[PDB]
Amino acid sequence: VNPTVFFDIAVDGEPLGRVSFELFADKVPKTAENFRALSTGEKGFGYKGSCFHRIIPGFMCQGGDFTRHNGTGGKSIYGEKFEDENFILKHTGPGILSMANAGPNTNGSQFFICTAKTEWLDGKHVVFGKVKEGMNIVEAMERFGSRNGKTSKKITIADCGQLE
Template sequence: MFHRGLLHLARPRVFFDIKIGKAPAGRVEFMLFNDVCPLTAENFRALCTGEKGLGASNKPLFYKDSRMHRIIPKFMIQGGDFTKGNGTGGESIYGFQFRDENFDLRHNEPFLLSMANAGPNTNGSQFFITTVPCPWLDGKHTVFGKVVAGTDVVKKMEAVGTNREYLMVLRV
């Protein structure tokens, strides 16, 4: 039990400062499950810091100023396409895509952080935040973190839905 506590303390935290339109909406803080999904958690962490420089797409590997391009109330909020901004792009720190790491964790509660993909082994930079339990996603998307502060901001984002005029811009 003590050992698991140490692992929990070692989990990295990152944050997004969110804007809705031009107005600041607040900060969302994530805890990453690097003890369960080290490659996936490191990909997200590094994309939050921008420390890896330019990717193969010749764009910065960085979430800063990227948009939440898909918001479905009572389901999820998706973002992370910093190459095209519309959900058709993105890139991981390991190259364009990387393999599914594991499906050990379940989509059994709101505010989980999970990888968006286009099928098996197609993880890049896109992610989503659940707003309800989503068990139908188990075995298809890797859960690698959760929201630990700013659930009120997530709810504000969810309330807007996908609206081209008010897409969320991330500040990391």
């Protein structure tokens, strides 16, 4: 069965709610495994304590830069970067979980959660999961964003891991 992972989100340290994701290991196993592992912290590093640094209402919430907290950092469990695994899955609407990147074959740890259809990213960003529970919490996060992506309070992954 495809893994499920959770993030417990906080706003300036105050608990907001939980978001869970299905990871599509049956279609993108290498990309799913990176995110799953970063969420449990089992390799010794990962998402716990990191922030969502770019949040643009009507577009996406982006996080996963656990090393520099601003879009310039992050790393995968495979090394600094890894290849685009495939583009089987498309950006079909809100709730899609996809890899951020800086060019072909530059996946690290940064990811985004779509809050709109983003079809222009098809074939350029690897889609590897989707929000299961707590899309309403993603919508609540989105309200702390802005047109340029700066957040009006610190949005953090206070805890994270894998659900049965």
